[PDB]
């Protein structure tokens, strides 16, 4: 077996919103996982002070969106391998073996298994396609609105079915680290 990628539940984190509400703001393209830059117009934001915006008109808003691993991902994660009761594409999840046909590395599909991809749990070269987009804020105080499809890891968890330890025929128990029958 060789390791293509690992996947787990992604953590939705948003940097703090820039409003310099007289002149335009410029963002920078970053190598973050599923990094997105958008600029937004007139919101005239409020904080607890209630007045953070000189030039009540002319407003510009900056917001960024990216995903990164949830802090529990060193335990609750799935490993995708390619390798007989084993199919050509197998999925390892906490000692349970599933013969899922996961998408290839670089071919991310939102709302499905393997929507976020990285080589290791500590790897910084994370790629993701979660179909995240930014919406125009309408309420008078400051916030970021965003809509996004659900985690395909949790949806695949729901429809995983039985693992290969009860699926593989000829009465043999699948054992993990390394994969074997």
């Amino acid at each position: 077996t060789n390791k293509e990628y690992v996947t787990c539940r992604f953590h939705t984190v948003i940097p703090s919103p820039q409003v310099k509400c007289c002149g335009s703001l410029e963002c920078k393209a970053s190598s973050k996982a599923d990094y997105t830059c958008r600029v937004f117009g007139g919101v005239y934001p409020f904080m607890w002070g209630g007045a953070q915006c000189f030039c009540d008109s002319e407003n510009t808003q900056l917001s960024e969106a990216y995903v990164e691993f949830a802090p529990d991902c060193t335990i609750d994660h799935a490993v995708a391998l390619k390798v007989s009761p084993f199919d050509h594409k197998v999925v390892i999840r906490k000692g349970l073996v599933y013969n899922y046909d996961f998408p290839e590395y670089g071919a991310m599909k939102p709302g499905a298994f393997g929507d976020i991809q990285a080589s290791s749990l500590d790897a910084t070269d994370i790629v993701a396609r979660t179909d995240i987009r930014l919406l125009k804020p309408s309420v008078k105080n400051i916030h970021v609105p965003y809509t996004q499809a659900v985690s395909g890891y949790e949806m695949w968890k729901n429809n995983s079915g039985r693992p290969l330890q009860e699926t593989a025929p000829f009465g043999c128990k699948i054992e993990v680290e390394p994969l074997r029958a």
């Epitope: 335009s24 410029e26 963002c27 920078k28 393209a29 190598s31 599923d34 990094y35 997105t36 830059c37 958008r38 600029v39 117009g41 125009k136």
Partner: antibody, heavy 128, light 107 residues
Framework: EVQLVESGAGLVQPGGSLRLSCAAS????????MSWVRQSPGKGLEWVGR??????????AYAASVKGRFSISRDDSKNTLYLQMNSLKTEDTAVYYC???????????????????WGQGVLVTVSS | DIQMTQSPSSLSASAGDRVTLTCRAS??????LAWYQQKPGKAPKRLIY???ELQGGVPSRFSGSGSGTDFTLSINSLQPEDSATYFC?????????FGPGTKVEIK
Amino acid sequence: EVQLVESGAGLVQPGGSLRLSCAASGFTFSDSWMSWVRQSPGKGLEWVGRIKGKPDGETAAYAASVKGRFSISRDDSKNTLYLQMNSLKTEDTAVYYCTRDDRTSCRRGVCYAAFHSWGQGVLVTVSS
Amino acid sequence: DIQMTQSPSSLSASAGDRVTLTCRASQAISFYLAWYQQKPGKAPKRLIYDASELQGGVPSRFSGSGSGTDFTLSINSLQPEDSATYFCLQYDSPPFTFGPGTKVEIK
């Protein structure tokens, strides 16, 4: 306010070369996208080319009819925009503009920018 | 190349009435349309970028909305220094194409 001034245009021989200048001032020059705008008498507005910033590598895109003949050469020491055009055809007699592009969205890395600033425009005549 | 259409081309009106101007895009641009206008003998000026929100430097009577292939340019009051030729630009893929324009005049 972003100041963009054009100079260096005039009456030239067809099938030759010249060098005009767009001295950019009023912004951070090392991280802004520059584009050029061409206007025809009797037709609409035409795009020429785009260049990127210093972390991108100063690469240059171009239109369909200007590939291999136009050369944009920027320099950060004196903050001006140059255009080395060669093989002046009969369809290049126009009024040119130099523009500043601020980026509005960088969806998964690639950045898409509109046309934010503009110059006063100078006219070039390619005839005999 | 992405083709720009500009309909209509002659929408002369009076002050304070209802004028709606559109710019159809051919392929499925998400919201990347920028709205311009042109004084005669002057430089162009941008009005609305990202097709929904108002740029700083312009009054609040200009507004736009739309996504996909149909967009609008809603004018609240035709104050008589709005006599210009409105332009629309896509900035999604090269080459960036301008519309032919609409000569709106006020008499």
